[PDB]
């Protein structure tokens, strides 16, 4: 809890480098990285999306070299989306934009999000429609009230499980996450063009106003991510969310702690 | 292990070349285009012809002989022939009655790398059941995991007219010795926006002030500049590419090997 000085020396720095895959709903054995073709409730009251139509937050707990009082301090992050060029595949049974047109490319509503934490990302539930019945097998806001639609402090949770927390009913809880650095962007709209930059030259610093990064409780580093890139439009017009993996490389150092 | 920068009368040198775009090159007359794009009968049977597939362009530049290695320090690059995209009269698709032709626009990948060795590629597939055509180097032993991430699919950008753009990306887990930059903008109506200037330098040094080091006295320029699609009168669409200029400042760095 009390943060003392940075230990330097021969064995004071270490590196995690992994990729997180996208859980987009994964209908069947052949469609990993897609959702199931989206359907719309008969009525506003009866909204109940199937689990394979709901993208979810991805999380990874990484065990770090054992210590001890010393804790691992996450100092810098590099991340990029892996496989951006795959979105140029405009020939795989898509929807011809017009007579003899190529297929309409992946585009539309996008959530690109990633966090680096010394513990689980902390989530606040917010519901578009509080009567939405989230499907068996997902962890969702419990005891939904109309207030759930704007804000309801009952809906707290930890991003502690994969294929679990739907994207559309959880956000980073801004009242918590002292020990995490989170960044995300929603671009909404059916025609929003994907814009994905890649570079191995961009480092992001994880230190706060006091020069302290996230501190890895239990010698664990917590990478969370979502990269819903848009929707794939099938020949029929039917639409599937399409996701992509995110690379992380985190510099860590040792910090003395009481 | 990287020692100090050698300075003096002949410590600096410059490479300056252009890379051409390989976009499919359908026939003798359509260099810089792809073949008019077709769409598979089914999701399962996706199998694009080789002349419908833009590919990464690469160029190995031999440097002066010199333990000393050449350090790539700065890059200037721009797309050559941006104005050519104003050609709205060459059997295009009238946007409307008495309209000019629809200009080149839509899905674009602008990418360029400067490396002391080949760009290192990771395979990622839109559809793992896509059959990449005979004559291209593609991800082998595709599994459904190939669609999101599959570490089997490693490769070197070591050959032209070879590596399709749509199934290879810079491998972010490698490329210590390369500086790569690219942007995908997707969408049928995405407007091209291409800036040109001889006044904009990009620095290639890392967090430790070391640029790429040219193994074997070789500098590796890679690039892709799929600008959009040309829409023919029929509505049929061909990718259109443009050449990329590079000018790389290099200096000599002492190294223990």
């Amino acid at each position, epitope marked *: 809890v009390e943060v003392l000085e940075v230990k330097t020396g021969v064995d004071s720095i270490t590196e995690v480098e992994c990729f997180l895959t996208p859980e987009m709903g994964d209908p069947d*054995e*052949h*469609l990993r990285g897609f959702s199931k*073709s989206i359907s719309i409730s008969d009525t506003f009251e009866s909204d109940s999306p199937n689990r394979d139509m709901l993208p979810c937050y991805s999380v990874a707990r990484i065990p770090l070299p054992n210590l001890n009082i010393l804790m691992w301090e996450a100092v810098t992050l590099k991340t990029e989306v892996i496989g951006v060029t795959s979105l140029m595949n405009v020939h795989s*049974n898509g929807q011809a934009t017009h007579d003899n047109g190529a297929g309409k490319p992946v585009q539309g509503t996008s959530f690109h999000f990633f966090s680096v934490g010394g513990e689980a990302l902390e989530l606040q539930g917010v519901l578009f429609n509080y009567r939405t019945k989230y499907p068996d097998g997902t962890i969702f806001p419990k005891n939904a009230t109309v207030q759930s639609q704007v804000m309801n402090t009952e809906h707290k949770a930890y991003l502690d499980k994969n294929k679990a927390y739907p994207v559309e009913c959880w956000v980073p809880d801004p009242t918590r996450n002292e020990n995490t650095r989170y960044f995300g962007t929603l671009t909404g709209g059916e025609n929003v063009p994907p814009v994905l930059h890649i570079t191995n030259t961009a480092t992001t610093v994880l230190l706060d106003e006091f020069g302290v990064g996230p501190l890895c409780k239990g010698d664990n580093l917590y990478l969370s991510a979502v990269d819903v890139c848009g929707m794939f439009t*099938n*020949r*029929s017009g*039917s639409q599937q969310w399409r996701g992509l993996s995110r690379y992380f490389k985190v510099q860590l150092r040792k910090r003395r702690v009481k | 292990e990287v020692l100090e920068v050698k300075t003096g009368v002949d410590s600096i040198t410059e490479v300056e070349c252009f890379l051409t775009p390989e976009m499919g090159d359908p026939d003798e007359h359509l260099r810089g285009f792809s073949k008019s794009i077709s769409i598979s009968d*089914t*999701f*399962e*049977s996706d199998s694009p012809n080789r002349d419908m597939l833009p590919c990464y362009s690469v160029a190995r530049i031999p440097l002066p002989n010199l333990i000393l290695m050449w350090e790539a320090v700065t890059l200037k690059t721009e797309v050559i022939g941006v104005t050519s995209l104003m050609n709205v009269h060459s059997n295009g698709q009238a946007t409307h009655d008495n309209g000019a032709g629809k200009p080149v626009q839509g899905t674009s990948f602008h990418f360029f790398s400067v490396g002391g060795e080949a760009l290192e590629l990771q395979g990622v597939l839109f559809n793992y*059941r896509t059959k990449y055509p005979d004559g291209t180097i593609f991800p082998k032993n595709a599994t459904v995991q190939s669609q999101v991430m599959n570490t089997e699919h490693k490769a070197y950008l070591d050959k032209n007219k070879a590596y399709p753009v749509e199934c290879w990306v810079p491998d972010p887990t490698r490329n210590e010795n390369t500086r790569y930059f690219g942007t995908l903008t997707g969408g049928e109506n995405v407007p091209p926006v291409l800036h040109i200037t001889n006044t904009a330098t990009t620095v290639l040094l890392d967090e430790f002030g070391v640029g790429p080091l040219c193994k074997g006295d070789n500098l590796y320029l890679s690039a892709v500049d799929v600008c959009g699609m040309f829409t023919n009168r029929s509505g049929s669409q061909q990718w259109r590419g443009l050449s990329r200029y590079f000018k790389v400042q290099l200096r000599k760095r002492r190294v223990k090997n």
Partner: nanobody
Amino acid sequence: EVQLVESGGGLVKPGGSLRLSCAASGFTFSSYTMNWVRQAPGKGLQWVSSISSSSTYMYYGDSVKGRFTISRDNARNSLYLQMNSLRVEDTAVYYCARYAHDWNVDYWGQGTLVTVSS
């Protein structure tokens, strides 16, 4: 373009057995989930069984659970249905059909008649 051809259908006595064959030409058979659907004389259609491209996922209608077995040989471009413990109700023309993504069930064969009578 795409043709499916069924065979093996005929007369067998209740409690009997029978193996049906679908011969696929015109497409990479080995790439598609394949289905058996049957049609009892004068009644509508009724799905029997499905099998994935790699035979990882077989599904059966309730009416034949435990009696019928679907199988494929991707090297021989052929889908099979093993029909054991046949009943009078199992009398129908048995059709072989392809499922493609987004298309759903698209191409059918000519069907082969299975008559179960003493």
